[PDB]
A paper describes a structure:
Structures were obtained for wildtype [name] complexed with and without acetoacetyl-CoA to 2.8 Å and 2.5 Å resolution, respectively. Although no substrates or inhibitors could be co-crystallized with wildtype crystals, the inhibitor acetoacetyl-CoA could be soaked into these crystals. Interestingly, only two monomers (Molecules A and B) of the tetramer have acetoacetyl-CoA bound, presumably due to the crystal packing. Binding of acetoacetyl-CoA to Molecules C and D would result in steric clashes between the adenine ring of FAD in Mol C and loop residues located between Glu151 and His156 of symmetry related Mol A, and between the FAD adenine of Mol D and the loop comprised of Glu105-His106-Leu107 of symmetry related Mol B. As in the structures of other acyl-CoA dehydrogenases, the carbonyl oxygen of the fatty acyl-CoA moiety of the substrate makes hydrogen bonds to the 2’-hydroxyl of the FAD ribityl chain (2.8 Å) and to the peptide backbone of (Gly412-N, 2.6 Å). New hydrogen bonding interactions contributing to significant CoA binding affinity are observed upon ligand binding. Arg424, situated at the entrance of the binding pocket, reorients from a position ~ 5.0 Å from the CoA phosphate into the active site, forming a hydrogen bond (3.3 Å) with the phosphate of the CoA. His228-Nε makes an H-bond with the phosphate of CoA. Having rotated approximately 125 degrees from its position in the unbound structure, the hydroxyl group of Tyr282 makes an H-bond with His228-ND1, so that the phenyl ring of Tyr282 stacks with the adenine ring of CoA. In the wild type structure, the chain starts at Glu34 (monomer A) or Leu36 (monomers B, C, and D). The C-terminal residue Lys430 is observed in all the monomers in the 2.8 Å structure of the wild type protein complexed with acetoacetyl-CoA, but not in the 2.5 Å wild type ligand-free and 2.0 Å (E291Q mutant) structures.
Author numbering:
A (entry chain D), D (entry chain A): 33 to 430
B (entry chain C), C (entry chain B): 33 to 429
Write the structure that this text describes.
């Protein structure tokens, strides 16, 4: 059948558009949008004050079949393609709730394990993940080291068949409701190469030495339990280490593409959200004898935004298609992420200007999405880094 | 002697720079800065939680002589010039403490009373205000009528020498600590336009009928008590009238320039703080054996912000000199409010970025400047309005 | 089977990339790229000084079959899908020779006739237009009206089955070389709107009263013979009428999407060429020791550039596919022309800067590119008018 | 007394505004304006075709006191304050005639000579130059070295009390009409950094081995005779050396501030010209029944342009004031050159878009302007070099 293009639809969020989809995805959509209308938005204004969401919507989440959607079915996941697990990405954005740490779990942590883990490890965790009992997260950053992920200090020493973890990890998405945490740690301090001596681990909550810090007070993402994680001589087991020892950077390198494709879709989706939202506010808010939307200026400001969102959507869709065939390279990934997150902010700022005074009020969706979008250029690897990598191929014959 | 302009100064916020100031102005600014570092900066974290600052501080600022600076001294104010009052707006900006509403109080509310109010009204209010015992505020906006003042539904019917007040004003600053508020009320539903039937009233705290509503929840300005104000049949005595009846729109007119200059200067000043703050951060944050300030991309992103800040500041300081002389017209003040307020957010944004993760943390001074910055392009008249006005001398003849 | 996207390709101009082309298209693109390299590129400077290309290059283009790559084989064209016609648009842009007014001929005029004209007309023109012996041009814009098309004044009055054409057009492409010009004229001086009283006419070089004005001096498109046209009491035989009398404007709205889409792709292809040409320069230009491609700022700029270009490229290849399926509406068509033409200029500005002073010398491809680009946001309907339209579906019904 | 500022005047280009000028200055402005109105504008098209102005307009300029205005009266110049010199800069800009290379001549070359030249040099050149009978041109950029001024190859080696000059310089304004050219050349290859091994040389039209190359084809400055220069084993006497040996790079870094300040003023002045040409155009253009000036989008775009132009002018005049007092540093000057030249191209682009199809026809002032403006961000130090220097004092503490 003929699916319309985003620019031609009645709404950017309209279900049933964009050729990278099929009628089967249409139906899975109603469900995810419906699930949020009933299980997420109704309580988010309560989880924000809390500093995290309930563990109750996490089990409901898994029970519904939205966690681990693109994780193979013969491992403990629904076993769908990417074209549909991203619909879970997109839909959370179309609801404006940055509390639930779904994707950071479904699309990233559930992906490392099912991709670089061992028989024992897969079965131990993948079922819990899809279930909703085990909450995943990852800790790469350190208060003193960041984009330079080559200069961290956390480490796990060689003790018997055990690894002794020592360190701290600031800024961890879902660092309070965590059960399983993929911590990046140095195993070779004298490692002749920053890349050659970093290992991955799966530290589990309930261990001696693993303390969780208070929920970090941020300017946005008020409902995300970001917190500092500590490691006080945690005696890890032989099942602790993930992938080969001193080969962490290798497993990380093969995941980023996906991570950035995710962050990206969300950004643009979140943009399609604010657009239709802002479009509505002006199509009614009356002034100077009729509506603001009757003003030429606003009409042109609107054309500019819809055009920029549409154009970028085409790129993100195109990137999803590639990734389906596993032919989406690290660079093309960095483009989608970089453009989409920079776009999300630009759109947010303008969209708030359009509400005027009520865009600063926490009551309207847009104000929350403003401080919610200023985290995109900062995490997942700053957009300054995205340029470095993109530029790698341009300037050097590598 | 000779002074340096922001560009050549060791730091944009140094004391003793910018040619529109004198040695005396410098001495004063040093005082005001000290005040903020010790009587405001230390309590802000609490006020943010509080959702409002203390009357304690407002009154300390009274003895100090920061309230009513450019208000004549033979009228209850401390009677300095415009540069001196400007200094207090700038200094509050340099402390990154949005909580205190000092500016609106002496820059706006107190001007309205000393410029159009009555002799008896002056005696009763000015000194109380210069001391900070009577915190003043102003309420023009209404839920659906902000950038269109003619569409204000708050009205005052006549009843003897009394006026009955009814209506609802949203977004009012200091609507939790306000003792005297200037309300914009329609007094003549019968007139060629609200611009001919509006009056200003001095609604005091405690008049039966004046319900100070709940503090609104915003994304920034966490320590400035922003609230809704309700008026139910308030019995306003003759004395409440400020200026001539149905002349409110004319007085508002006369004051708007200064209101725009004030935001102009706060905005540029706010940008000045962020810049020197971010500059410092990149010089300390370590990356690759060296500092992130060694990067060429960063170096350039800084030259851009600084250049755009130094440039805008020049214009704004040129507008301060023009207002001193009472020669800053409506358009020019609009240009200042516009360019500076717009510039403020673009500076906020590029600045959070250079902070990386932390810029997001409410721990860093910047994150608070970011949310405290998204307000400038909106209040005091959206930039869209400034453009329409600026454009009147351009397009029409 | 598998094809890389511009991002992964070794160059955005590489033959054999982009999902919307069959291995058959590749082979074709190679002959066209060969055509411009060998038949256009070497003689362009000569045409630049002359202000118009040779008739030879046109005929050479008809023989190679580039004129009407998407006009029905049975009507007199060479047939082929839109993706093919596009290649000829794209390849020209890639040679950076805005001289040949090929696209307007093939993609527009040849299309107005095989879409609304009679068989006598179709038969009489289409064969020689593809052969490149008859150069066509479109002429609607006038001295006082372009955007607001219903504001024209060229009129056609009936005198028998004959037509008396009067008026003038300005900014007409392929103007001095045109043998055939589709003129837009008001036929019904009184109707609901000029939108319902407009007709089309095929004016032929030779008819008495058809005077070709002086060639125009422009900042760019130096080899594009842009001229002014004058119609002095022209008696057009009945066959001159193209389409149902007083329906023209409706015919025009139908073809606009094509025009916009065309511009869109020329625009982005130009940017593709430009980025590639600049990446080349920065890598072979040394300074302070290593090349200027090593400098971190030069990289990040290139990265931004490559991104915005690949992102736009996609949206355009999206509109090509859509137009192939006869499914490209006005708005979507508008988005492409607008976003792309502006991205075009922006890329040009940055690319010149990257060349340093050499980016100002006519000798380097980047300078013609800069001035040749400034026209896209203007013709084919101004970017403002593009928005006005894209905004209708957004705001109204 | 009460001089209006650019925002308040009836026009940005009106005479008698801006607080940095005296009533005397206005009289002088009227004089200089009439001169372009009558002596330059009327003949510019023909110089455009020719690729150079006439020696006669230079001479008419010299006899009427427009050359060497800020040059010492007693040394040969007319002896006016910086502001008068600037007035000439500005008026040439207001006329939209970038043909006459007067600014480089009076503003750059003549300053170099009277600043670091001997008494014999001053007497031998200044009076001719103020008389427009001796045209000046500076030449330091080369086919392989521009931004990297420390990378030039042009050199001179001593031979008795003579110097042997060899090399080539590109992009030399006034290169065609020049009678004297200050040539930057290396005089000491063994210096630690070539910054200490450079010297200035007064090459004179006619010296053996001094060849004027091909007059360059550009996208703009069609009437500015920019050319390529050659020096093949020239025997320079001792007098030829301007200033002291190896102290060349020093004399230059000391003059740059004036080069950039001048470019900054020309830039913003060009922006004022374009504003008013366009304002007046949109106001007299009919479309859809009303003038285009009436379209709200057009008023805001115009309001933006004006505010940004008035704001930069404010910075620039403040910079002229500082320079007159000799207290304008390298960094400030750079901020000015940078911001203004960028704004110029920005304004030119918008202004062309408002003229519509006419802004592309050379017949219209705005077209000369758009192309003529693209060079400002490149010469006198590329805007990127401008940032390099501005950042220097932001990131480095004494
Ligand atoms: C590469 C190149 O070099 C090519 C070139 O530059 S050649 C020159 C290109 N020129 C252009 O593109 C001209 C640009 N102008 C336009 O697109 C339009 O004039 C415009 C966008 C400015 C809008 O003009 P407008 O006056 O608002 O037209 P609009 O409002 O749509 O007119 C309404 C009418 O359209 C009519 N209409 C349009 N298409 C119709 C159709 N197919 N069937 C029936 N009616 C139709 C409606 O009936 C409607 O009737 P009314 O006037 O009674 O309401
Ligand atoms: C319209 C027109 O006509 C305008 C034109 O285009 S004319 C030509 C315009 N050309 C330009 O503007 C060239 C632009 N380039 C430059 O200005 C410089 O090359 C530059 C800004 C890029 C800096 O170059 P650089 O190689 O980094 O120089 P830099 O590193 O600062 O050199 C350091 C030295 O300067 C020396 N220095 C500078 N001025 C000095 C002085 N006057 N006395 C003593 N030392 C001085 C310092 O002692 C220092 O010594 P070290 O070698 O021990 O470090
Ligand atoms: C809400 C939120 C959730 C997050 N969740 C996680 C998580 O779950 N796990 C985790 O480990 N981290 C997470 N982070 C942390 C985040 O990924 C890091 O803060 C970010 O990737 C790097 O920030 P930094 O300050 O450490 O980088 P810094 O090194 O401090 O960089 C500071 C500035 O210098 C710039 N700079 C440094 N190097 C370069 C360069 N090479 N070129 C140009 N500029 C450069 C940076 O881009 C940035 O602009 C999260 C952050 C936030 C805000
Ligand atoms: C935190 C905060 C503090 C404030 N403090 C005060 C205060 O103390 N006292 C007070 O009275 N008010 C104050 N305000 C209110 C503020 O001044 C008003 O919100 C503002 O003046 C008008 O915005 P609005 O909410 O009325 O939106 P509206 O004016 O209804 O709509 C504005 C939106 O439509 C656009 N629009 C409107 N008109 C035009 C136009 N003509 N052309 C093009 N676009 C247009 C605007 O640019 C913007 O996009 C404050 C507001 C906030 C948020
Ligand atoms: C080199 C070149 C080749 C061209 N070839 C052809 C050709 O072959 N045949 C042909 O007929 N034309 C052609 N044109 C002309 C071109 O199509 C028109 O110039 C253009 O479509 C409209 O410009 P205009 O001259 O009508 O300017 P105007 O329509 O007068 O517009 C002037 C300014 O007002 C703006 N404006 C107008 N209306 C609005 C509005 N409603 N809202 C907001 N802003 C508005 C315009 O965008 C512009 O900023 C060509 C132009 C050039 C330069
Ligand atoms: C019309 C015209 C007239 C001129 N008149 C004169 C004259 O009369 N006399 C004279 O000698 N010169 C003159 N010039 C030359 C001009 O000053 C130089 O072209 C300019 O200063 C440097 O450009 P370039 O050609 O050296 O480019 P390059 O310096 O070779 O390369 C410049 C490109 O690389 C970038 N780049 C280089 N270094 C850095 C850096 N370190 N960091 C970041 N980016 C960098 C530049 O920003 C730009 O993108 C003129 C030039 C033109 C165009």
């Amino acid at each position: 059948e003929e699916r319309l293009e985003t620019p031609s639809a009645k709404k950017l969020t309209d279900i049933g558009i964009r050729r990278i989809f099929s009628p089967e995805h249409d139906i899975f959509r109603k469900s995810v949008r419906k699930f949020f209308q009933e299980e997420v938005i109704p309580h988010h204004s309560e989880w924000e004050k809390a500093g995290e969401v309930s563990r109750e919507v996490w089990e409901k989440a898994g029970k519904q079949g939205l966690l681990g959607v693109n994780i193979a079915e013969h491992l403990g996941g629904i076993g769908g393609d990417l074209y549909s697990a991203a619909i879970v990405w997109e839909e959370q954005a179309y609801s404006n709730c940055s509390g639930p740490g779904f994707s950071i779990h479904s699309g990233i942590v559930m992906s490392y394990i099912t991709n670089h883990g061992s028989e024992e490890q897969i079965k131990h965790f993948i079922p819990q993940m899809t279930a909703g009992k085990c909450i995943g997260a990852i800790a790469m950053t350190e208060p003193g080291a960041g984009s330079d992920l080559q200069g961290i200090k956390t480490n796990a020493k060689k003790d018997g068949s055990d690894w002794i973890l020592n360190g701290s990890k600031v800024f961890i998405s879902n660092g309070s409701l965590s059960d399983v945490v993929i911590v990046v740690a140095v195993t070779n301090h004298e490692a002749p190469s920053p890349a050659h001596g970093i290992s991955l681990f799966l530290v589990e909550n309930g261990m001696k030495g693993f303390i969780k810090g208070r929920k970090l007070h941020k300017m946005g993402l008020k409902a995300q339990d970001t917190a500092e994680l500590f490691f006080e001589d945690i005696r890890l087991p032989a099942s602790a280490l993930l992938g080969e020892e001193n080969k962490g950077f290798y497993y990380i390198m093969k995941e980023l593409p996906q991570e950035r494709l995710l962050i990206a879709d969300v950004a643009i989706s979140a943009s399609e959200f604010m657009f239709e939202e802002t479009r509505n506010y002006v199509k009614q808010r009356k002034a100077f004898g009729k509506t603001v939307a009757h003003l030429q200026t606003v009409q042109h400001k609107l054309a500019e935004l819809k055009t920029h969102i549409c154009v970028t959507r085409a790129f993100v869709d195109n990137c999803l298609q590639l990734h389906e065939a596993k032919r989406l390279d690290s660079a093309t990934a960095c483009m989608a992420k970089y453009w989409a997150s920079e776009l999300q902010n630009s759109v947010a700022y303008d969209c708030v200007q359009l509400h005027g005074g009520w865009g600063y009020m926490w009551e309207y969706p847009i104000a929350k999405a403003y401080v919610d979008a200023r985290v995109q250029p900062i995490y997942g690897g700053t957009n300054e880094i995205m340029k470095e990598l993109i530029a790698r191929e341009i300037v050097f014959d590598k």
